[PDB]
Design a protein around this ligand. Structure first.
Ligand SMILES: NC(=O)c1ccc[n+]([C@@H]2O[C@H](COP(=O)([O-])OP(=O)(O)OC[C@H]3O[C@@H](n4cnc5c(N)ncnc54)[C@H](O)[C@@H]3O)[C@@H](O)[C@H]2O)c1
Ligand SMILES: NC(=O)c1ccc[n+]([C@@H]2O[C@H](COP(=O)([O-])OP(=O)(O)OC[C@H]3O[C@@H](n4cnc5c(N)ncnc54)[C@H](O)[C@@H]3O)[C@@H](O)[C@H]2O)c1
Ligand SMILES: NC(=O)c1ccc[n+]([C@@H]2O[C@H](COP(=O)([O-])OP(=O)(O)OC[C@H]3O[C@@H](n4cnc5c(N)ncnc54)[C@H](O)[C@@H]3O)[C@@H](O)[C@H]2O)c1
Ligand SMILES: NC(=O)c1ccc[n+]([C@@H]2O[C@H](COP(=O)([O-])OP(=O)(O)OC[C@H]3O[C@@H](n4cnc5c(N)ncnc54)[C@H](O)[C@@H]3O)[C@@H](O)[C@H]2O)c1
Ligand SMILES: Oc1cc(Cl)ccc1Oc1ccc(Cl)cc1Cl
Ligand SMILES: Oc1cc(Cl)ccc1Oc1ccc(Cl)cc1Cl
Ligand SMILES: Oc1cc(Cl)ccc1Oc1ccc(Cl)cc1Cl
Ligand SMILES: Oc1cc(Cl)ccc1Oc1ccc(Cl)cc1Cl
Lengths: 257, 257, 257, 257
């Protein structure tokens, strides 16, 4: 197992459809020891149960809107773990009304701020809070992004701006932390039916177009995303930092198919 | 000239060193009629005086932190102009402390929020507010970005995340408005000594490195940026939308020089 | 006219549908003086006639397969002109059989070599031969490329590899010549029905998909490409080198529309 | 390991410094069965000896200048293996004189043709020749590229054009073969002292600049490149095709460091 001895904190696992669940399962299959966060109290039981199936009893509340909660996660986790080898950012949010229809009609200052704070700022915020536990460990951060960072896409709207901010965040974090032995990389995943995906108007059509038009002629799975994250969290990828890797069956590199 | 009679609103002109001044002068040279905004009352006289030299008496206060002020500009401008042919976004802000030293140490939630709101959200906010005046005119929007959008750069820090958000904003705005006959493009300018540039720690060294390492072996001018904006505002560029054009003397495409 | 006093050599003009014709017409409208090349003797009369309508009697044979013919163009042109301010590369070739159907089935060593030699090597070959006439003149080179450089596209096949080589050629030429006052830029044009376009199997479908899916919801014109080339050949673009500018109505920056 | 029983053909292994050696060792560590090619008879013994240390007695001559030799490899290999799961392209060549000094002065038609034929065409040529043995196996191809594909770099010169062609080749091969269950990906490696590296004028300074300026503040190893190739050859990367992955310690995403 190529993550033997790695201790990895995973955000964003709320169901077995979650990308973070695929990541968790892939990492555990490679021998990682896991810990998890959940955004609100209502989810605690569900997440503890999934964590238990993945051999973990380390679960912490963390709304990334809160610097106090972010910092408290690492304080609490630090009582159990000497250091942190892996950090998975698999979280995003924007108000549903901002992800439907005309980009300018649907945008607002408040939706823009929320989308960026939760979807983009949270990466440097978590990296910063994790830094004492991660530095010097030859450790790694993986964050999830989407093609909307670099292409205009119907309905994704302000989340595209937030993902672009996130990808730049990945690059700046990588440049910041590389000398102290922390890597930071992104996965730009193709569409996958998850709980959050239903917030994007006409998600079913995005999903269908990609399967019809990508080189693989099918959509990717949370196992495929998960195995890629596991690689990027492992010492196998020690030469790679500041990279965005596309796990979309080649969709982004194809045109007019 | 190739903007003869075109009516263009320009943000961000605060001195004769401003990129927006170079844009203004370039547009006026091609026959455009201009109007201007200024962030606070303390600048009104200075901006009115520059505007007068460019044959304009149309000057409006606009802090892009304020949706009221943004929308009031177009209400007031609309008393003079029956439509708007061009809109120039040449504005940015982040707290100076966030643009000095280690990326994660210098970042904060509040600095992130400010940087994104003023530097990135302001593009769709202005596009949205201008839309009734611009649509159906084969009109155009130009916004100013920087390499920090797509590369990690020392000291630019959180402004890089904001510029990435901005460039995605340009793409989404272009996709949104293209059917209505409004284009939206970006210029990624090389470093230029402007008032805002002094907010970046060690800007003088950044400026020097580019001149020593780009294909042209010199920095670009506000006239060069300005002429590019004039082109992108004109019907000559009617086949171009959602584009980021580098006016950095080739710096971005060079390595190891 | 922003090309007043500019002397520009244009390759590739074989009919009034040619991209090079749109370039020629756009440049002449801005006051440029023109000269032209043609690949074989059979075309001489047709090209001389088009050149005459554009106020030029300077027409030279040039098969870019031949170093002797390339060099002879500048020797001959140098009898009339003191220097050369603009050079337009608007030429490409690959055997038709290599641009139909399965990429690997259709490729061959010989087709690959031809495609690259004529479509890609010709840019540095012409730049190199033109260099004595262009250096120190604040002059400029523009070459035409296509999205196949950076995306896989059905049927374009080995021409995509040649266009990628070309775009790198543009970057290396820009880096090479920038200090001596020669710029080199590319235009990646959207699909346009030209003589050469019929060599691509199912070109009509490419053309239709782009018009249905790009931000402008229409294809671009040779006037739009031409006006962009005119800008890139003019002193207005003096801050820009090594750049690929997309004149495809935003097609490349849109996805899933 | 994650390549257990997978049969992988590796080109380009000429010494223990070779990138292909790092790939070979990484694949063998994950359980792969290997076979190898060598360019000329003079190398046969050296390569057989390295192959033996990696538990292989399958070694074949292959100068990729020769379509006969390329196709003969798979005919001969096919006597031992009923199919092929992995193919590694780790080969390049250009005349040394073309990789020294001014790009245009050093280039020639013949050097361009050689560089592209050996460095770029060889990827689709090998993919094409391997296709009967690879299809239907959920198999994979990996090829090695360099930053010169997408940035101008001193002295790398015409090899940059060839690498750009190669990367497009990777994209087109991926699009071509995806339905048949063959993936094709690239690794853009940072500088590593190998035999071929000495062909680049002033390679030692290039190597030094990267270590001084990348996020990791060091150069990558053939083990790091190798482990990445092993991942891209394995079913773990089944969601990834047509991708270029940077294993350069973040060099490409950094600027002005
Ligand atoms: N599903 C896809 O097609 C897809 C494609 C590309 C990228 N992504 C990205 O993958 C990541 C995971 O999304 P997913 O599709 O697995 O959806 P998901 O709904 O399974 O997970 C989204 C997670 O974000 C968390 N979250 C939201 N607001 C939060 C806050 N304030 N604090 C902490 N956590 C918060 C949610 O609780 C949830 O666990 C996201 O970044 C998403 O943008 C998804
Ligand atoms: N100077 C450079 O090297 C350079 C390079 C690339 C991009 N840019 C970008 O060019 C644009 C113009 O900056 P410049 O360098 O000409 O500097 P400048 O200081 O002349 O202009 C910056 C402008 O931003 C305006 N601004 C700041 N906060 C504002 C607010 N809340 N509301 C409205 N306006 C506000 C300022 O009043 C000022 O007019 C910016 O987007 C900057 O990021 C500059
Ligand atoms: N039409 C399009 O949709 C489109 C889109 C993007 C890029 N381009 C590019 O635009 C450029 C011009 O093509 P076009 O579409 O106007 O077609 P065109 O047929 O009008 O021009 C192609 C030209 O290439 C010339 N040529 C071919 N082999 C030559 C040789 N050995 N020596 C000298 N000249 C030679 C032809 O004689 C012809 O003049 C090409 O580089 C093409 O790849 C075209
Ligand atoms: N070393 C680096 O810094 C570096 C960085 C990025 C990419 N690369 C690429 O990695 C690959 C491997 O090179 P390396 O650096 O390991 O050097 P190397 O010298 O160990 O390997 C180069 C190989 O190319 C083979 N080759 C050359 N001409 C050939 C022909 N006609 N037919 C068949 N094989 C031929 C050589 O025999 C040799 O085995 C190349 O594609 C190179 O461009 C190298
Ligand atoms: O980023 C995503 C991209 C896709 Cl294709 C599908 C789901 C995604 O994830 C989200 C989408 C919308 C919201 Cl409000 C929150 C999240 Cl996490
Ligand atoms: O974005 C920029 C990039 C450069 Cl190289 C120089 C100046 C720039 O403009 C700014 C820099 C810092 C702040 Cl706080 C505000 C602005 Cl407008
Ligand atoms: O590059 C092109 C791209 C497009 Cl969409 C249309 C035409 C193009 O130009 C060519 C296509 C094929 C051949 Cl054989 C030669 C040339 Cl010049
Ligand atoms: O592509 C490369 C890039 C780097 Cl930084 C180092 C070595 C490389 O490999 C080569 C360099 C020159 C020649 Cl002639 C052949 C090969 Cl294989």
């Amino acid at each position: 197992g190529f993550l033997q001895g790695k201790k990895i904190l995973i955000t964003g696992m709320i169901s077995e459809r979650s990308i973070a669940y695929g990541i968790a399962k892939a990492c555990r299959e490679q021998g990682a020891e896991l810990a998890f966060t959940y955004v609100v109290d209502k989810l605690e039981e569900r997440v503890r149960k999934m964590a238990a199936e993945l051999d973990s009893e380390l679960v912490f509340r963390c709304d990334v809107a809160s610097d106090d909660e972010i910092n408290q996660v690492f304080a609490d986790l630090g009582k159990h773990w000497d250091g942190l080898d892996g950090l998975v950012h698999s979280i995003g949010f924007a108000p549903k009304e901002a992800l439907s229809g005309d980009f300018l009609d649907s945008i607002s200052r408040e939706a823009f701020n929320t989308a960026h704070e939760i979807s983009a700022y949270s990466l440097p915020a978590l990296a910063k809070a994790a830094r004492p536990m991660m530095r010097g460990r030859n450790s790694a951060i993986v964050a999830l992004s989407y093609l909307g960072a670099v292409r205009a896409i119907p309905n994704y709207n302000v989340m595209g701006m937030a993902k672009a901010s996130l990808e730049a965040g990945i690059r700046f974090t990588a440049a910041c932390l590389g000398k102290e032995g922390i890597r930071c990389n992104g996965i730009s995943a193709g569409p996958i039916k998850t709980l959050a995906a239903s917030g994007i108007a006409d998600f079913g059509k995005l999903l269908g177009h990609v399967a019809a038009h990508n080189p693989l002629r099918r959509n990717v799975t949370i196992e495929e995303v998960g195995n890629t994250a596991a690689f990027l969290l492992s010492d196998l990828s020690s030469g790679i930092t500041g990279e965005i890797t596309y796990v979309d069956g080649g969709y982004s590199i194809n045109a007019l198919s």
